[PDB]
Amino acid sequence: AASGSALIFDEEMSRYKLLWTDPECEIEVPERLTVSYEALRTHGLAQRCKAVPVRQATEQEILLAHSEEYLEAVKQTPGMNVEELMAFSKKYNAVYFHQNIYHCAKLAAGATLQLVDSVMKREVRNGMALVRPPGHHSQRSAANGFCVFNNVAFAALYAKKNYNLNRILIVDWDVHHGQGIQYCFEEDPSVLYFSWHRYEHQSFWPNLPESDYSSVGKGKGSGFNINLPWNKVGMTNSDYLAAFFHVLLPVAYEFDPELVIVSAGFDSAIGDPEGEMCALPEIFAHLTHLLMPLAAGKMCVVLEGGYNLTSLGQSVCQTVHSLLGDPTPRISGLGTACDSALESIQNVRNVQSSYWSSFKHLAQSETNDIVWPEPLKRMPASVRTVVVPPPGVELTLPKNCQHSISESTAKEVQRIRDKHFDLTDQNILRSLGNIISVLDRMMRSDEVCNGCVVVSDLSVSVQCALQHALTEPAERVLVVYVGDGELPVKTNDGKVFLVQICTKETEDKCVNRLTLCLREGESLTAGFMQALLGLILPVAYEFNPALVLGIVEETTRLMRVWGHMTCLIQGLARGRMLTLLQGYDKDLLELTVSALSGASISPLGPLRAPKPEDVEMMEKQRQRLQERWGLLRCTVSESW
Ligand SMILES: O=C(/C=C/C1CCN(CCc2ccccc2)CC1)NO
Numbered sequence: 001a002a003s004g005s006a007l008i009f010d011e012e013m014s015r016y017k018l019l020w021t022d023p024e025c026e027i028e029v030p031e032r033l034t035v036s037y038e039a040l041r042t043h044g045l046a047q048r049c050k051a052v053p054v055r056q057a058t059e060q061e062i063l064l065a066h067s068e069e070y071l072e073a074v075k076q077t078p079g080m081n082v083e084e085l086m087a088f089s090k091k092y093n094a095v096y097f098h099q100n101i102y103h104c105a106k107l108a109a110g111a112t113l114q115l116v117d118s119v120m121k122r123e124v125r126n127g128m129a130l131v132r133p134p135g136h137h138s139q140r141s142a143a144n145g146f147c148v149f150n151n152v153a154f155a156a157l158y159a160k161k162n163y164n165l166n167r168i169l170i171v172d173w174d175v176h177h178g179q180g181i182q183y184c185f186e187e188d189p190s191v192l193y194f195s196w197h198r199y200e201h202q203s204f205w206p207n208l209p210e211s212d213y214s215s216v217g218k219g220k221g222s223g224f225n226i227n228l229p230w231n232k233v234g235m236t237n238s239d240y241l242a243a244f245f246h247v248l249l250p251v252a253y254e255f256d257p258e259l260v261i262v263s264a265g266f267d268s269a270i271g272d273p274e275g276e277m278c279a280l281p282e283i284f285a286h287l288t289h290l291l292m293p294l295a296a297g298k299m300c301v302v303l304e305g306g307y308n309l310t311s312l313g314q315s316v317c318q319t320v321h322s323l324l325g326d327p328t329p330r331i332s333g334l335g336t337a338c339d340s341a342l343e344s345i346q347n348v349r350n351v352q353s354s355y356w357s358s359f360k361h362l363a364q365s366e367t368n369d370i371v372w373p374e375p376l377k378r379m380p381a382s383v384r385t386v387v388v389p390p391p392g393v394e395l396t397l398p399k400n401c402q403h404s405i406s407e408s409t410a411k412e413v414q415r416i417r418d419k420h421f422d423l424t425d426q427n428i429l430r431s432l433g434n435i436i437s438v439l440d441r442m443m444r445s446d447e448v449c450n451g452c453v454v455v456s457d458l459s460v461s462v463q464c465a466l467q468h469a470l471t472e473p474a475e476r477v478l479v480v481y482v483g484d485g486e487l488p489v490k491t492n493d494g495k496v497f498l499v500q501i502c503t504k505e506t507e508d509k510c511v512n513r514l515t516l517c518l519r520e521g522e523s524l525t526a527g528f529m530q531a532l533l534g535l536i537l538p539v540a541y542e543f544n545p546a547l548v549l550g551i552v553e554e555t556t557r558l559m560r561v562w563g564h565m566t567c568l569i570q571g572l573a574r575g576r577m578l579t580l581l582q583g584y585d586k587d588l589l590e591l592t593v594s595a596l597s598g599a600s601i602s603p604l605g606p607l608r609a610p611k612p613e614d615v616e617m618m619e620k621q622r623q624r625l626q627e628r629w630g631l632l633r634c635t636v637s638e639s640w
């Protein structure tokens with residue numbers, strides 16, 4: 001399977017610049033490329049990426065997305081003097097030309113195609129192209145907003161033509177609306193385009209009516225354009241995550257793209273003079289991470305904007321850290337999106353309910369100088385995942401997993417056995433040695449990250465796992481439990497939150513438990529995904545645990561989704577998750593280790609839309625919990 005991450009960059013694309021004064025374009029500088037690549041080098045991330053050379057987009061490739069007339073006129077700019085380049089620039093909105101910009105434009109476009117080829121030829125799993133000029137504003141016959149050619153549109157057109165792709169997701173998290181991309185694909189259901197952007201009721205550039213939430217596509221492409229306008233500046237991590245959990249991710253996993261392309265502008269990051277938003281660079285580590293289980297990880301991140309040379313470097317690194325599989329930073333202080341964001345979110349959801357399953361219950365009333373902390377260090381664990389299979393069972397393990405028991409810890413198991421258990425089943429007592437040994441390696445060391453242990457007795461294993469974590473001390477523990485029955489977990493001191501996926505409808509009282517009973521049947525897979533994206537993830541992120549404890553009991557149905565959840569849930573607790581599998585099940589154990597270890601998640605494909613009973617159940621849980629956990633909100637709250 002493909003491994004590694006490409007980094008496509010070339011110093012030549014920094015060799016064009018503004019040659020006259022124009023405060024509109026004053027901010028698009030060569031140093032954005034220089035600073036971004038030099039920050040990747042400073043943090044050791046460039047050295048870990050497969051360098052892939054830049055190339056020029058050919059004339060035929062340029063014409064996938066642009067007209068002959070426009071290409072001919074741009075082809076003349078290398079021969080123009082400064083006076084002539086200014087006259088040519090003035091024909092377009094917020095764009096400057098330079099004797100070398102045509103050359104660099106073909107490089108920025110060729111680099112994107114180099115990226116697309118390396119990912120689709122399985123030479124790498126994913127990658128990033130640092131390019132200049134940006135693309136997403138470019139249109140079929142015009143330059144616009146610093147863009148000459150539409151790099152990301154090329155990539156989707158080229159991947160369609162050269163790899164026969166039917167479904168391509170484009171995620172545009174730049175702070176500006178990528179109207180060039182939207183115009184490109186508005187009638188094309190094969191390309192799904194998502195963009196959030198500073199709109200301010202159309203008063204922010206490029207001031208377009210069709211940048212609003214109501215542009216859902218045209219014709220056969222209706223429903224494959226999703227605009228989320230930001231009508232206030234200052235949007236926070238919670239707004240960005242609320243957009244992902246309640247708009248982008250539900251749509252993207254139902255669409256099931258064969259390739260993901262990110263228009264990665266970082267002007268949506270704190271400190272940027274254009275975006276004036278407040279999201280920390282670390283949020284881009286999660287934006288990337290939450291998209292990585294799509295399309296078996298085939299993700300092409302293409303740089304667009306980003307103008308604060310400092311927030312720029314830190315967001316590029318956070319993105320590449322996640323592309324490389326490094327553990328995610330903990331995001332603290334999450335809560336409800338602001339009212340403006342919930343308004344935009346609720347309006348997109350409503351207008352899109354005609355087109356997407358995860359929104360369809362909405363349609364019938366039966367169913368309805370700036371400073372911030374420098375990001376902490378992210379270092380890959382030397383051994384990522386520890387595994388403890390049943391005694392004697394050896395398994396073919398990924399190159400970053402080991403099998404598990406010191407006398408020091410063997411003392412601890414005696415101490416616990418003497419007080420709380422009596423227990424003499426000397427096998428269970430090995431389970432407890434394993435849990436403690438794995439947990440100690442997970443939290444004490446930065447060279448083991450997570451782990452899975454097979455166990456026989458759930459309650460004693462769960463108890464010591466939980467009690468040993470709560471005493472390290474891990475401030476908070478998220479517990480995710482697939483099974484029925486009550487476990488020895490006391491989730492009423494604020495330190496534990498319990499997600500339980502069961503088969504019997506059990507009323508839960510208090511707001512530190514989320515219990516989901518999904519009616520059995522073929523629709524079980526889609527219902528689980530809907531609760532994962534819309535409930536489990538929003539709560540888990542607000543909760544912000546220091547350890548995640550997964551628990552599966554021997555009583556299959558889970559095998560189709562367990563890998564997505566294991567992958568997504570590693571956005572919490574810096575990836576520190578300990579999974580207890582009750583009984584042996586080589587396939588469940590292989591899948592868990594594979595997702596724990598950072599491998600690609602195989603796609604879900606086409607799923608039967610979820611049962612309405614399950615969607616009423618999950619909206620009842622959201623009603624019951626969103627007042628405590630504001631990140632669950634996807635509507636504006638009732639003003640009393
Ligand atoms: O990063 C991008 C392009 C971002 C551009 C958009 C257009 N404004 C210029 C608008 C302006 C600025 C100052 C005075 C008068 C007008 C600059 C930034 N897209 O992702």
Ligand SMILES: [K+]
Nearest residue numbers: 172174176195
């Ligand atoms: K955008």
Ligand SMILES: [K+]
Nearest residue numbers: 185188191224
């Ligand atoms: K489209």
Ligand SMILES: [Zn+2]
Nearest residue numbers: 174176265305
């Ligand atoms: Zn931008």
